[PDB]
Design an enzyme around this catalytic site. Structure first.
Site, short mmCIF file in Angstrom:
data_model
loop_
_atom_site.label_atom_id
_atom_site.label_comp_id
_atom_site.label_asym_id
_atom_site.label_seq_id
_atom_site.Cartn_x
_atom_site.Cartn_y
_atom_site.Cartn_z
N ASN B 186 37.42 45.17 35.86
CA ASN B 186 36.67 44.02 35.33
C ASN B 186 36.45 42.90 36.36
OD1 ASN B 186 38.76 44.52 32.49
ND2 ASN B 186 36.71 45.37 32.76
N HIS B 188 38.72 41.27 38.02
CA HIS B 188 39.78 40.27 37.91
C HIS B 188 40.92 40.68 38.84
CE1 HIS B 188 38.47 37.76 34.57
NE2 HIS B 188 37.90 38.85 34.05
N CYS B 223 44.32 33.64 39.27
CA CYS B 223 43.68 33.36 40.55
C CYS B 223 42.31 34.06 40.55
CB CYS B 223 44.56 33.85 41.71
SG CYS B 223 43.75 33.82 43.34
#
Ligand SMILES: O=C(Nc1ccccc1)Nc1cccnc1
Ligand SMILES: O=C(Nc1ccccc1)Nc1cccnc1
Lengths: 263, 265
Positions: B186, B188, B223
């Site tokens: 995704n 991330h 983050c």
């Protein structure tokens, strides 16, 4: 994994993992490269090895000089990928390791790779020709007739790579290896260099295109305390020229090319 | 991999790879963490997830890690086979817990254990929330009803509060940035990458003379792929203990805090 019936090549099946895939739910070129490196080590283990009875007495190691990978279809998350690898002497120049990637369900070739390896004294870092003793002990585990993953005379894996001229079109500065980027000997893993080359490719390219071909020359090794700058310029499908160099003095560590096809 | 006879847990065997091992020819804690994440994903796939439920997908809710605790007794060597067993458990309206047991496939002995706390969060607004009744009922059919704890002890290390590292840190690793191999499907940052960033600020002389035995990691903020991280470490202590802090290189915004216990080789 297991050696084939003749003992001149090695085969291993891999289930693609959830953390090994990219945004398109398919394996990344770095995951593919890690798997080629894994089946290469299991092939050496199964035949009694990089370390040999002659190389170890001289402190000689095999170092990658060039890597070429061509993917037609990246395996999806959960798919089974069968890889076949084999070695071949190339006279005194060095050794070549070749791979064929297949879809385990259909039997179709989904990728192919080839790599050139040169001899080097591990302590002095000096290149060397392949002498008669290491050549003799290698030919017992290699096919005697030529067997090429890229058979074509004067194909993409044997083409010279030019040096990127400043200024680069795109750049990724301050790239540093962490402990997960080192191998069991505390040396930076040769796959990490592939990822650093690709860090300077625009995200717009990654999202609309798929990596088809990558050729990477290895000129110098990056120490765990070194800092790298990745540079890219479009030479054109989309084609790019790549350059990895130390953030400070500009010392070249790698150069390469990538070919991308529109999704 | 496969679900056990009762269908309330999942088991999978892994051959340790050449690129997965450290200087001691044994698997790193990041390789171990990647395998716990892999068997967790295959457990969710085998029971019908995509790891969101029908109600979670309808409400745009996801599971986010709040804490991870891993304790290793023996790291598997290059070529060894490691069997991992995982299971989930509701913890009322607070959230869910995923627990793991690591075993040596040849001897059957337990070589490690792990536990993790997960909280519900709206994927769009990033707002945390309590687990509703409908979600609680949907996963209770795949969870053991009697408590089954990887860390049973009433006062155990996985439930201890972690203090904030006070400046100045004893050791530091500055300008840590994620690359594409650190992102998931995704786009991330992978929760395992945070473990490696915590460990980047541990001195190499500690890594070479000691082995990581316990690690507890709190997850406070995510983050982004364009963020820059600073990893900080201070010795709190034969064994060696450390306090850890991950924060953004600029404003100093906290993303993670943790502790590590190391024993002399
Ligand atoms: O194939 C190897 N390295 C590699 C592969 C793909 C990309 C980058 C690097 N290593 C290796 C080691 C031992 C025996 N054979 C091969
Ligand atoms: O457990 C997971 N991640 C993780 C594991 C160890 C360390 C850091 C992160 N992921 C996951 C995802 C979906 C279902 N179950 C588990």
């Amino acid at each position: 994994g297991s050696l084939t019936e003749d003992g001149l090549s090695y085969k291993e099946k891999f289930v693609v993992r959830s953390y090994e895939v990219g945004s398109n739910k398919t394996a990344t070129v770095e995951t593919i490269a890690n798997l080629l490196q894994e089946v290469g080590c299991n092939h050496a283990q199964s035949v009694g090895f990089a370390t040999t009875t002659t190389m170890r007495k001289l402190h000689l190691i095999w170092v990658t000089a060039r890597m070429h990978i061509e993917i037609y279809k990246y395996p999806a998350w959960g798919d089974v990928v069968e890889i076949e690898t084999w070695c071949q002497s190339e006279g005194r120049i060095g050794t070549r390791r070749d791979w064929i990637l297949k879809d385990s369900v259909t039997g179709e070739v989904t990728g192919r790779a080839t790599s050139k390896w040169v001899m080097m004294n591990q302590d002095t870092r000096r290149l060397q020709k392949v002498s008669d003793d290491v050549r003799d002990e290698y030919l017992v585990f290699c096919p005697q007739e030529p067997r090429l993953a890229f058979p074509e005379e004067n194909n993409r894996s044997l083409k010279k790579i030019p040096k990127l001229e400043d200024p680069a079109q795109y750049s990724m500065i301050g790239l540093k290896p962490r402990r997960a980027d080192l191998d069991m000997n505390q040396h930076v893993n040769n796959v990490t260099y592939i990822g650093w080359v690709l860090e300077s490719i625009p995200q717009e390219i990654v999202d609309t295109h798929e990596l088809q071909v990558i050729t990477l020359d290895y000129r110098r090794e990056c120490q765990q305390d070194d800092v790298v700058d990745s540079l890219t310029t479009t030479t054109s499908d989309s084609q790019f020229l790549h350059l990895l160099r130390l953030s400070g003095d500009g010392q070249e560590i790698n150069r390469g090319t990538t070919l991308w096809r529109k999704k």
